[PDB]
């Protein structure tokens, strides 16, 4: 069975019910100079019971669109 993309990120907003905003915080190389530049990509994830809190390391798996911007489903709360 095919695998959907899973990301590890940090919660930066939980003031919405049944959802959270997570940040991936990857690094990329500058095309010209080759230095690693910080890059913050953040997604909206559906929380079933608002378990996650702000500033928590979590895992999210991409899913079918659940709202206008929701595209991910919470899996774990790695740290608080």
């Amino acid at each position: 069975r095919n695998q959907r993309k899973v990301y590890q990120g940090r919660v930066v907003s939980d003031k919405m019910d049944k959802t959270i905003t997570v940040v991936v915080e990857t690094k990329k190389n500058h095309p010209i100079y080759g230095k690693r530049m910080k890059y913050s990509k953040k997604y909206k994830a559906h929380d079933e019971n608002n378990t996650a809190k702000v500033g928590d390391i979590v895992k999210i798996m991409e899913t079918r669109p659940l709202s206008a911007t929701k595209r991910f489903r919470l899996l774990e709360v790695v740290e608080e």
Binding site: Y33, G34, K35, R36
Partner: protein, 131 residues
């Protein structure tokens, strides 16, 4: 503050060679020991030794000068810098002066010269050029 101890070691060697000093001393580290032994076995430096102290140890290098006090080490250049790391794939391993020099590289097999790196067919981080 000192941000590139490897580059500092290279510069110490460069200056000592420039003034034709017989020996030099540096604060010790694993990477510095690796570089020193590579130079030792490549014949760029006459000898290496270590002293155990209570900070980090000291590494002493005895330089090598040929007949007429000709300098064996022409120069050293730091390639991978904290500001800009440099990595090369196995095919991209550089040849210094068509092999007359060497390129010290850190790889998953350890710190080795470019010859050894391309013999093993692996890349790594190009620590320095020496010639």
């Amino acid at each position: 503050v000192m941000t590139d101890p490897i580059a500092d070691f290279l510069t110490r060697i460069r200056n000592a060679n420039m003034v034709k000093h017989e020996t030099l001393e540096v604060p010790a580290s694993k990477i510095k020991r690796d570089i020193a032994e590579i130079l030792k076995r490549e014949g760029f430096i006459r000898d290496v030794e270590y002293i155990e102290d209570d900070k980090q140890g000291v590494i002493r290098v005895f330089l090598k000068y040929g007949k007429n006090e000709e300098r064996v080490i022409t120069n050293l250049k730091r390639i991978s810098k904290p500001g800009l790391r440099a990595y090369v794939k196995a095919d991209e391993v550089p040849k210094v002066l068509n092999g007359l020099g060497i390129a010290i590289i850190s790889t998953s097999e350890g710190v080795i010269t470019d010859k050894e790196a391309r013999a093993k067919n692996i890349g790594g981080e190009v620590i320095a050029y020496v010639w």
